[PDB]
Amino acid sequence: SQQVDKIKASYPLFLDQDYKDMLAKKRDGFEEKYPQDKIDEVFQWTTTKEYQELNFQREALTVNPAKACQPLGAVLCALGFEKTMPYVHGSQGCVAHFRSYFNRHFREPVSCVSDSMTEDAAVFGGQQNMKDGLQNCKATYKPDMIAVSTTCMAEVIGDDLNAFINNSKKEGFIPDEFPVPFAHTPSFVGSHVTGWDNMFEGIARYFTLKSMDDKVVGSNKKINIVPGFETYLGNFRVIKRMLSEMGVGYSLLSDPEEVLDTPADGQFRMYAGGTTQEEMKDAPNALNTVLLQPWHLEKTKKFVEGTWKHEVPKLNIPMGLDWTDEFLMKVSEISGQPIPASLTKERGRLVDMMTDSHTWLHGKRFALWGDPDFVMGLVKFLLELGCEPVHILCHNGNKRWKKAVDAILAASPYGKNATVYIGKDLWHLRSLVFTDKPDFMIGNSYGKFIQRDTLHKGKEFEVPLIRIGFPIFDRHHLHRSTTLGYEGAMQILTTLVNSILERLDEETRGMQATDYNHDLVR
Amino acid sequence: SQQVDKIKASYPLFLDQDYKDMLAKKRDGFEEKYPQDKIDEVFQWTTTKEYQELNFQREALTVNPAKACQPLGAVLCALGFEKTMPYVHGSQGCVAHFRSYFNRHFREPVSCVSDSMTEDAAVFGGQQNMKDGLQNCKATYKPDMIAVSTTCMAEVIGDDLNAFINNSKKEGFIPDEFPVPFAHTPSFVGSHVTGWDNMFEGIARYFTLKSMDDKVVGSNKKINIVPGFETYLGNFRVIKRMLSEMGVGYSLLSDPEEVLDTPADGQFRMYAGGTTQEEMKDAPNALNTVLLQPWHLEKTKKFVEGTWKHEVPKLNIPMGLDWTDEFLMKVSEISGQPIPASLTKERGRLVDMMTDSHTWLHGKRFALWGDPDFVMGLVKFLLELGCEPVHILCHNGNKRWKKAVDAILAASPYGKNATVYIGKDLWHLRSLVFTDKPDFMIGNSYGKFIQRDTLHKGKEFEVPLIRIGFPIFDRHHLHRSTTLGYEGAMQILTTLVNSILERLDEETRGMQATDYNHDLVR
Amino acid sequence: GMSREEVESLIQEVLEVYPEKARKDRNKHLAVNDPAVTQSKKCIISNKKSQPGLMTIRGCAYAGSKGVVWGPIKDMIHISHGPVGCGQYSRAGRRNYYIGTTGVNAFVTMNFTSDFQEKDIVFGGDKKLAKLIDEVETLFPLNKGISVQSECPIGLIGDDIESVSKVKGAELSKTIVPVRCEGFRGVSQSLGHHIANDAVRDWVLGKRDEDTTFASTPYDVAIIGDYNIGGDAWSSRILLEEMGLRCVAQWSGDGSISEIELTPKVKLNLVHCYRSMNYISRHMEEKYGIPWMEYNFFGPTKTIESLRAIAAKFDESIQKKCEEVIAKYKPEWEAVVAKYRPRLEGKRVMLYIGGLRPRHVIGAYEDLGMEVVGTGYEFAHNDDYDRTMKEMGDSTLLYDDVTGYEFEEFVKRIKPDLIGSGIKEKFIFQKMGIPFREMHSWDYSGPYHGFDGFAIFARDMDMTLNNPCWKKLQAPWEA
Amino acid sequence: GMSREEVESLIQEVLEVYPEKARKDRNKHLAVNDPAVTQSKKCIISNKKSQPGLMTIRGCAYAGSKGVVWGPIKDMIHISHGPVGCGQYSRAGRRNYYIGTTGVNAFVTMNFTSDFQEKDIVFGGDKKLAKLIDEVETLFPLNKGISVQSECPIGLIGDDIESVSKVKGAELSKTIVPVRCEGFRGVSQSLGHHIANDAVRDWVLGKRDEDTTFASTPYDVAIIGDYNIGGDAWSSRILLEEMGLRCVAQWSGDGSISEIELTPKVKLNLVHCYRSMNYISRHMEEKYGIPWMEYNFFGPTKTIESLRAIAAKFDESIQKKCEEVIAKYKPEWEAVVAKYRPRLEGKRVMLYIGGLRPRHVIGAYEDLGMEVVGTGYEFAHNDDYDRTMKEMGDSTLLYDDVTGYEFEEFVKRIKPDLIGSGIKEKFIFQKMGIPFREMHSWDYSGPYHGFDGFAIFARDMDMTLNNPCWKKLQAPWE
Numbered sequence A, B: 001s002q003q004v005d006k007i008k009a010s011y012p013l014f015l016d017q018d019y020k021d022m023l024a025k026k027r028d029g030f031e032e033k034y035p036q037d038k039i040d041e042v043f044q045w046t047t048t049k050e051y052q053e054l055n056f057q058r059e060a061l062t063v064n065p066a067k068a069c070q071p072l073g074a075v076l077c078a079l080g081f082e083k084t085m086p087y088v089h090g091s092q093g094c095v096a097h098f099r100s101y102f103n104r105h106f107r108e109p110v111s112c113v114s115d116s117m118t119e120d121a122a123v124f125g126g127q128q129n130m131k132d133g134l135q136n137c138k139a140t141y142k143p144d145m146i147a148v149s150t151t152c153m154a155e156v157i158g159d160d161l162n163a164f165i166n167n168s169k170k171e172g173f174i175p176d177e178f179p180v181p182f183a184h185t186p187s188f189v190g191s192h193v194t195g196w197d198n199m200f201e202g203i204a205r206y207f208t209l210k211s212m213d214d215k216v217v218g219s220n221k222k223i224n225i226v227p228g229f230e231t232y233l234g235n236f237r238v239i240k241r242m243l244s245e246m247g248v249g250y251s252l253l254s255d256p257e258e259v260l261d262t263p264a265d266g267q268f269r270m271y272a273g274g275t276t277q278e279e280m281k282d283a284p285n286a287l288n289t290v291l292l293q294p295w296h297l298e299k300t301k302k303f304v305e306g307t308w309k310h311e312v313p314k315l316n317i318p319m320g321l322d323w324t325d326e327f328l329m330k331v332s333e334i335s336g337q338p339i340p341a342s343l344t345k346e347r348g349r350l351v352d353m354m355t356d357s358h359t360w361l362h363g364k365r366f367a368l369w370g371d372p373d374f375v376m377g378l379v380k381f382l383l384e385l386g387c388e389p390v391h392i393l394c395h396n397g398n399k400r401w402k403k404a405v406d407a408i409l410a411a412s413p414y415g416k417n418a419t420v421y422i423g424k425d426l427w428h429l430r431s432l433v434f435t436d437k438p439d440f441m442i443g444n445s446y447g448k449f450i451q452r453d454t455l456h457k458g459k460e461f462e463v464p465l466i467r468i469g470f471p472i473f474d475r476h477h478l479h480r481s482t483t484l485g486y487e488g489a490m491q492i493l494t495t496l497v498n499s500i501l502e503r504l505d506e507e508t509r510g511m512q513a514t515d516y517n518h519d520l521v522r
Numbered sequence C: 001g002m003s004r005e006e007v008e009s010l011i012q013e014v015l016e017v018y019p020e021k022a023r024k025d026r027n028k029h030l031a032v033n034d035p036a037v038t039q040s041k042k043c044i045i046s047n048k049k050s051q052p053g054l055m056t057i058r059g060c061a062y063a064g065s066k067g068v069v070w071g072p073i074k075d076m077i078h079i080s081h082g083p084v085g086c087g088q089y090s091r092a093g094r095r096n097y098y099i100g101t102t103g104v105n106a107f108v109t110m111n112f113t114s115d116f117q118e119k120d121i122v123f124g125g126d127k128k129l130a131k132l133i134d135e136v137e138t139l140f141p142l143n144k145g146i147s148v149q150s151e152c153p154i155g156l157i158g159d160d161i162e163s164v165s166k167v168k169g170a171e172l173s174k175t176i177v178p179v180r181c182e183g184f185r186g187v188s189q190s191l192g193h194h195i196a197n198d199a200v201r202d203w204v205l206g207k208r209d210e211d212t213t214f215a216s217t218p219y220d221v222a223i224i225g226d227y228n229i230g231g232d233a234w235s236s237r238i239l240l241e242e243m244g245l246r247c248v249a250q251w252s253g254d255g256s257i258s259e260i261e262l263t264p265k266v267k268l269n270l271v272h273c274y275r276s277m278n279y280i281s282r283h284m285e286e287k288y289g290i291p292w293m294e295y296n297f298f299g300p301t302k303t304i305e306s307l308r309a310i311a312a313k314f315d316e317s318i319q320k321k322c323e324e325v326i327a328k329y330k331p332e333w334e335a336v337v338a339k340y341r342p343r344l345e346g347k348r349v350m351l352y353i354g355g356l357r358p359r360h361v362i363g364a365y366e367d368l369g370m371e372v373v374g375t376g377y378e379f380a381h382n383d384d385y386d387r388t389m390k391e392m393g394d395s396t397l398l399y400d401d402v403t404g405y406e407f408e409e410f411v412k413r414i415k416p417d418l419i420g421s422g423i424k425e426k427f428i429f430q431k432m433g434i435p436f437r438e439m440h441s442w443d444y445s446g447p448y449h450g451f452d453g454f455a456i457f458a459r460d461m462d463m464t465l466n467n468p469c470w471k472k473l474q475a476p477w478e479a
Numbered sequence D: 001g002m003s004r005e006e007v008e009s010l011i012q013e014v015l016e017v018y019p020e021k022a023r024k025d026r027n028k029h030l031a032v033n034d035p036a037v038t039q040s041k042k043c044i045i046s047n048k049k050s051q052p053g054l055m056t057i058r059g060c061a062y063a064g065s066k067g068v069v070w071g072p073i074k075d076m077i078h079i080s081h082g083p084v085g086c087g088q089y090s091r092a093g094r095r096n097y098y099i100g101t102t103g104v105n106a107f108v109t110m111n112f113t114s115d116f117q118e119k120d121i122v123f124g125g126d127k128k129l130a131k132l133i134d135e136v137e138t139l140f141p142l143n144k145g146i147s148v149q150s151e152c153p154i155g156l157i158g159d160d161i162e163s164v165s166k167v168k169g170a171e172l173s174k175t176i177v178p179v180r181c182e183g184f185r186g187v188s189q190s191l192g193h194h195i196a197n198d199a200v201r202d203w204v205l206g207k208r209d210e211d212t213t214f215a216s217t218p219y220d221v222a223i224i225g226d227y228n229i230g231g232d233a234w235s236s237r238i239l240l241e242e243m244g245l246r247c248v249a250q251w252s253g254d255g256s257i258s259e260i261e262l263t264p265k266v267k268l269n270l271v272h273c274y275r276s277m278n279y280i281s282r283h284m285e286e287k288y289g290i291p292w293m294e295y296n297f298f299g300p301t302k303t304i305e306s307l308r309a310i311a312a313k314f315d316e317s318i319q320k321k322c323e324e325v326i327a328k329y330k331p332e333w334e335a336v337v338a339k340y341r342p343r344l345e346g347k348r349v350m351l352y353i354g355g356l357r358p359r360h361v362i363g364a365y366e367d368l369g370m371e372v373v374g375t376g377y378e379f380a381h382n383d384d385y386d387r388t389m390k391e392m393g394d395s396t397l398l399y400d401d402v403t404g405y406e407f408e409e410f411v412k413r414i415k416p417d418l419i420g421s422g423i424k425e426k427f428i429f430q431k432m433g434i435p436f437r438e439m440h441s442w443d444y445s446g447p448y449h450g451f452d453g454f455a456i457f458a459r460d461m462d463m464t465l466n467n468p469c470w471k472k473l474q475a476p477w478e
């Protein structure tokens, strides 16, 4: 039933007695459900050390991964170029999924096309799909460039992207000088971050590989910036803002920030902003090339160093206090521009926030996961704040990275109870947050079901989720935020200290029970 | 007792059985406490319509006010001037309180002096305190200017600030041309906002009243901006940024943003930034003067119109979509500068967020309070979002304001169940949120005890607080936020829609009970 | 609206952008309705391959199987067999509601996968799948069966998931269902349905063929093809049991394996989503003699019609409980109409959805006095188009497997008041200042089925279509 | 550290900035300790008027009455009588913890006010105050008393709150306490303590003089002057009751009016804060014959000293239970020293607090191997400075009613490792890169009293003094 002036959606409609009774009938009558004491018993068991050891002995089964696949990254990378259509050579179902994925995170349009290879092409190849696809897509959506990647079908059957695109040009499907950079991006190698590197390396190669003769390092006086797989708008904006604040000539190579934030003014803009072709062609003439997310831009680094001859500096992601300092001093050194008083002040302001807020941060224990650069930055900042990262999880992490993180933890007294996990998933993490309970999790939306699990054991066991990373599907507009620089450091600190203060208020809100510590001032 | 490796502070130390037992002893033996059943019965009664009617019949008693006193406002105003010392003529206890107040909200130093009038001066006047005070303050803290206000003691005994300051100059306690503007700021007239208005008018007068002869309207090509009592740093910053983005010459008159956000770099800076003396002197030469918070800048308006001959435009506070539009169009009109592509896009971006977020906002019911301009702006923005502002409270509001707000509510279908209350306090508000429960409260920290009260009646009765206003004492760094312009609109929208989504997650977090509606995507 | 000649020119104009091969194909999938025409094949073709590079909205056969049919079945563990992507992108994307203790006895929102790496591709994943099954068994002991939802590379590398399934099935005494729903098979989510229905038939449905212990009644029915989006299947069931019927199974929203195994014991299969489950329904009739009928629980008009059609298959006791149910909900839906119809009357809706809804929702719109001026399906066959042409007005637009470009251009011309489609369309139209409702996920709202869903549907249409945000897209200095 | 000649030169130098009149005064309020000096009046004066315009840290007599003494008393409603400021600035500012149902039977965090307007100043607020009493009675029926806390203008306009209180007191059969704590009286919070202790004596304390129905025991005590910041009084009480005593009242943290009324029945008054409550203690000895003693529950050393002194006032049975209390907590505080002392050993603290703590906390700093190199009070009298000069080392700095400018200049030179003072100082010294602990509000931590408090105190001093934030203040490119 419904009261027309107070209409109920699924919550709380299905709590009505009449739906409760019907749901009870369904269960008893037909579901053959395990008794609730047995469900209770099995629940308690999934929370134990015994279960955790069995859990960590998995070799074949992944449960609740914390990565996506390569072509997702290649798409994101491709969206940062001017009037560019991401074009994934293979099965169409992939592209539906990529699009919806980013749609839910950015709440924006995400344009991408497939060439809809089917079982036909799984046997005779998808050469025809690429000729007709390239031709179709250029004619219909009029990009100035098509940036091609691959799904696991095309990989497995061995489609030669290079030959397929060259033959598309030779038979007249697209014009000879129409830019079609590409990259094989197999979903069974690495992760989404690896596809971004592969795509970027493909585009740099397309525009520079055969034109190196006329290039001179430093002749354009700019510093190239490669952002890597980046899904906060504020990160791109902060990096541009700081560099213009220092007077530093720069080229941000893959810049999606406009096309992921077009205005609602009566018109749909399929393409906005983005790194220009001329910027990619002129990039070799930069003073140097700075990689924001070096742990998944290794292929790109090898090309930049090997072909462009740039001496890529050994910089961590510019996250937290020390690493943003290091970034800025390095930009200053390469460019000859001093760090201006405005950025010195912003730094000092960040320090000031640390000083006001240290007493609530001190010793707080976190579990956290994400992509390798993001995770190490977050670990570094947590240590700077006097917090204890306990459970550090990177599903797409590697052994070299894990070593680097372990050394970071070892340089600090706050790292002493920290373990770094590579190759493990959110079902592994769920065990850790029961067996060695932290104060909070820092992660993406998937983490909500861990928190749900912990609360089921008891209120005292609940570990609340602080949403920082990708994807965030269950809150609005957080993709507009900043994690990089002094700016993002300020935003993280604020969210951390206030998450702690909100949770304290919750714990002390009980009239005549806990509200003795319910202070107006904190 | 304590376990040395897991030390407990007051929460949760006093929940231990031996403290519980001891607290039980103290009550039974000595407190002669009312029985719990009787506390429960009286509590239930405070939640009822019958109690509300008695509650709203108060004429003499105020309980939990939502305003402060004039000189608070005068101090904030004075802090926005270059190397200025706020100086309150009267009792020292007022200044200790003013400082501490602002210290907790800003978590910064707040410098201000008293001339420490005592019972001696309550009888012979505080003329000696002002002569010694002005001299001591100038010599010790070296301001370039001392901006004087009064406490209720000085008002009641009738100290003539004008003659005391002139006699200070005449007898050589401070130089003749040392700037000493003043304003009488009686705490038993209006509120903190009225104090800001009196101080500002006093400084404007000091610097222009006798030099009007050579002034020509619009000869400097600037627009003066008077901000009113403002305690979010982002508001000052946003207004400046937008105006500079339009290429508009401006003078922000009272600009505390620097002194309220100095870096922690090894040095204490008593004074930073702020409107210069030459700026105040040259203000009459502006094209016009814009009052960002006109409902408490009435005295300033009379002076600006009557003496400077500016045709102060009839603008509301630049809050939400329509009113930021109006502000920008008025600035463009006065200045001759067009609104730039970047501001049109920012506006379009705000609209886009509204469109993405409308389905969770629609019909949500708010109770809310604050200073008149802030409250009307918030009411206006809620209406734009499709939300219903049900209980609108302004303790320092007046009848003309309430009429203006009532007209705003009648222009919208979303205003239909709204009532605006002036002269009422947070004890009045607490009754309203029981008898006619909204979804949230939007207010300052004091609101946290209302939420505590509602949760005591039952979880289904809890009204959560969303902190927007002044003071906010129980969260860190919110005073760095923005409530004005499209920027502030974006921050308010994001906080609203996520507070709704956080509360929904809380309600649906119950395993096998409510977690059917615990969606990864919202 | 538009004349037949105008729409027909709209089609021709939109198609002039394409190269000739894509143009000649596209032409066949865009029709101007004639509601007399009972043979859909006269006006429009369907269920063919997508043209390359045209930004189809279609999904794949894995989505049809795992995402749509098998996924929801709450007390089985469903394995995404392949690389990490597909399972991750579908994980908890679809609001197939259920009651359970997730991670203990129910597993719907979780993503189990084999996470294929290069060693598995080159040397096959059959030994990995076998060890995966033992791992699932140790860690999720209360699961009541497992399925293995094949992603693209499985069939391409020559893996034998059927053999693993029967070997491990025997070893553990457990139902393990191999599904060959690889994304290159077929042309859309549709073949996945078919594949999935064929896997239920072969590995599950037969299990109680010789079991005579279920105590059946004359009033036993199954809800076939309702995946309980926001609770729709719940809000449907309550009406059927108020009418005196016994709903033995739900396929597959809030669905259990036991309820699927008991379905051959019912007297009637009540099929909502014909597209997805007409396969198994035909099988159950051939094998068990169980009749089936199509129904529609969208808006009061259709619900009332269905309730009465369903009752008429039974005896008079059911037929008059029917009239009692209808009398009970009369004041509730009449109040929803009285409140909302005046707010929506005359407003024009364009739809694009998957295989049912583009027709099934039309009555609900008409019950609020709205007009569906356009509709279409990503993956329908011509038997869906037969059923649609009657439900649409003369000269309305029909589009099959619409491209992004086309749909955008159709909107610009038709200028509807309200679009209902999916997540990859919503943000596009919002920016053009056209109200958009998501008509798969219900924008996180619903249920929309039954009398209780109607009230939500009406509230939702109004909350969006008349929202204050839509007046604000022009900067006032560009008027 | 510094030679006497250096500190003495420091004083001179800082004072050169003042005009001659402020210079000659300030000189008398700043001293270089000599810990043999038993008579504080030889080295430094106190409890005089503030120099105008020097940015004193001092508060007012209202704050000493309402904020400090009466405010905490949980089951009475306390009225801020005057304009809207004062009650608003001290609403919930002070962490005087209590157990109750706020708005229903307890009222500590609420702000009740007459909100004076112009009509009230011009014509008086006596009829308003009488109508306010009746509205409190209707809306908060479970209140057990009312106080009326005069703000500045009350005395200035000639209002008669005493007569209102007797009249309404009689009509309603309720204790209504007029308090003349207007902020121009005195020179600081101090006079407010006095004024408030005199209002307790006159309107409340004598109420059960002729009531003999209380069942007393040989072991009945009251905790006088612990306002239970963060639970400090609770964390004191547990120890006294573990030692076998019966704590009848707490004045006034978690305090009830009936516990104040029963206090004349006790055997001994345990006075923590001498400054604020020596007045009433002296009264209870004169009138009731009840002895009183000072104690100190800050750190293990002082607490052990205090438990044993308290015990020795009673029989062998209490003295025995004492040694059992001490025995039980020995491992707990020893583990706190083992853990934290090595982290804080040799660190130098500068203090500036109100009227007790600047001396009372010194033993707890020393128990962690720390040195208090400087201390002072906003509103001490010379009886406080007497008790301080022994507790401080040779050549340490002493300051009374320190100005902002002074305290800053003193830190620049002394360069302590840690400064502990109030909210209006914290943010200044943080920007200087000096660790800072709030020593009124405990920085939202605590309790610090007793053995449970020590563990928190120690954790807190370490968490701040060794925090990683302090090494980051200088940009690396400078």
Ligand code: ICS
Residues within 6 Å of the ligand: C064, C068, C189, C225, C227, C229, C273, C274, C275, C276, C353, C354, C355, C356, C357, C358, C439, C440, C441
């Ligand atoms: S199944 Fe089909 S697409 Fe019949 S694949 Fe799809 S939950 Fe749609 S139009 Mo998303 S045939 Fe169900 C469907 Fe319709 S996912 Fe849902 S909404 S009624």
Ligand code: ICS
Residues within 6 Å of the ligand: D064, D068, D189, D225, D227, D229, D273, D274, D275, D276, D353, D354, D355, D356, D357, D358, D439, D440, D441
């Ligand atoms: S009462 Fe007093 S100022 Fe003895 S007015 Fe003050 S809660 Fe201080 S040094 Mo704030 S005499 Fe208590 C005091 Fe000491 S407020 Fe607290 S800390 S021990």
Ligand SMILES: [Ca+2]
Residues within 6 Å of the ligand: A106, A107, A108, B352, B353, B356, C427
């Ligand atoms: Ca958007």
Ligand SMILES: [Ca+2]
Residues within 6 Å of the ligand: A352, A353, A356, B106, B107, B108, D427
């Ligand atoms: Ca600060």
